């Protein structure tokens, strides 16, 4: 990251909802970032579902995901969310956020190759301990909002240590809004409601391409009640609207 500046006026959107969280927003052409909370911007949290971004790239890189047209077939046995109980494309599995699909990808990648690529990607604390199929869900892997926007900028620029084609495949799978001169790539996450005195984390990360500008963003918040989950999009959306992005 280049320069980061704390803008405490963004806290207004947080205190209104009694949310403890951070937003990091970087405008590409100026190589500068802003945040409501410098300290929390660098604090590391479980990636949860945002890990589908590196996991998908690594699956393609290692050949575990054969190509972008691979279909992940449902074996017909119960899955934890009904929206996952179906065959899914790579983009579908990311968009509906089908954990079991990505757990099996991780198992087939294996510990050695997973470690190799998180080191290549400078992904968080790069600690994969806790089980190959769950280190990013309940294990020891942690990543900060600053690190997310660094990783996403590299993906946007096709500068990750992976093939350009594999980065491009995952990028189209991350498109969540498309208009003639407005394009959003993003991914949500939710680690859970945590435990007593130890809240879970909710994420929204991505980037916005508007005209010839691009804005990288990462949001996280403490969460111990699922009813608060939509704030992971509404707080950053209000901030980006106040900046004229949205």
Measured CA distances, 117 to 67, 114, 140 (Å): 18, 5, 16
CB 233 within 8 A of CB 198: no
CA angle at residue 99 from 95 to 100, to 5 degrees?
A: 125
Range 112-141, binding ligand NXL (CB under 6 A): 137
| Options 1-9, 26-34, 176-184, 187-195: segment touching ligand NXL (CB under 6 A) | 187-195
Is 188 an interacting residue with respect to ligand NXL (CB under 6 A)?
A: yes
Residue 102's binding partner among ligand NXL, Br ion, Na ion, none (Cβ under 5 to 8 angstroms by kind) is: Br ion
Which residues line the annotated binding site?
97, 188, 190, 232
Check if 42 is active-site: no
Pick one of 25, 26, 48, 105: the residue that binds ligand NXL (CB under 6 A).
Answer: 48
Neighbouring CB atoms inside 10 A of 123's CB total: 24
User: Looking at beta carbons only, is 16 or 81 nearer to Br ion?
Assistant: 81
Is 236 an interacting residue with respect to ligand NXL (CB under 6 A)?
A: no
Is 97 an interacting residue with respect to ligand NXL (CB under 6 A)?
A: yes
Range 49-68, binding ligand NXL (CB under 6 A): 49
Nearest residue relative to ligand NXL (C-beta) = 49
Residue 190's binding partner among Na ion, ligand NXL, Br ion, none (Cβ under 5 to 8 angstroms by kind) is: ligand NXL
Is 189 an interacting residue with respect to ligand NXL (CB under 6 A)?
A: yes
52-62 and 164-173 helices, crossing angle to 10°: 140
Which distant-in-sequence residues (6+ apart) come within 8 Å of 136 by Cβ?
Answer: 46, 47, 48, 51, 55
| Options 15-23, 106-114, 139-147, 227-235: segment touching Br ion (CB under 5 A) | 227-235
Which residues are near Na ion by CB under 5 A?
45-46, 201
Strand locations in 28-163, DSSP E?
32-35, 44-45, 71-72, 88-89, 143-144
Neighbouring CB atoms inside 10 A of 97's CB total: 19
Is 201 in a helix, a strand, or coil? strand
Of 32, 49, 129, 154, the catalytic one is 49
Is 230 an interacting residue with respect to Br ion (CB under 5 A)?
A: yes
Measured CA distances, 174 to 20, 74, 82, 119, 152 (Å): 27, 22, 21, 23, 11
Residue 46's binding partner among Na ion, Br ion, ligand NXL, none (Cβ under 5 to 8 angstroms by kind) is: Na ion
Residues in contact with ligand NXL by the rule CB under 6 A: 48-49, 97, 99, 137, 188-190
Q: Catalytic residues, which ones? A: 49
């Amino acid at each position: 990251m280049g320069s980061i500046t704390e803008n405490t006026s963004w806290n207004k959107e947080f205190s209104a909802e009694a949310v403890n969280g951070v937003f990091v927003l970087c405008k590409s052409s100026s190589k500068s970032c802003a945040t409501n909370d410098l300290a929390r911007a660098s604090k590391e949290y479980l990636p949860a579902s945002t890990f589908k971004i590196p996991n998908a790239i690594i699956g393609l890189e290692t050949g575990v995901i054969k190509n972008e047209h691979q279909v992940f077939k449902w074996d017909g046995k119960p899955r934890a969310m009904k929206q996952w109980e179906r065959d899914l494309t790579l983009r579908g599995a990311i968009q509906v956020s089908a954990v079991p699909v990505f757990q099996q990808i991780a198992r087939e990648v294996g510990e050695v190759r997973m470690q190799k690529y998180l080191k290549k990607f400078s992904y968080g604390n790069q600690n994969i301990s806790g089980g190959i199929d769950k280190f990013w869900l309940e294990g020891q892997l942690r990543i900060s909002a600053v690190n997310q926007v660094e990783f996403l900028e590299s993906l946007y620029l096709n500068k990750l240590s992976a093939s350009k084609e594999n980065q491009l495949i995952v990028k189209e799978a991350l498109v969540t809004e498309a208009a003639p001169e407005y394009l959003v790539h993003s991914k949500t996450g939710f680690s859970g409601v945590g435990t007593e005195s130890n809240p879970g984390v909710a994420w929204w990360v991505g980037w916005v391409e508007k005209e010839t500008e691009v804005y990288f963003f990462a949001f996280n918040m403490d969460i111990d009640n699922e009813s608060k989950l939509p704030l992971r999009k509404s707080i950053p959306t209000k901030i980006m609207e106040s900046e004229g992005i949205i």
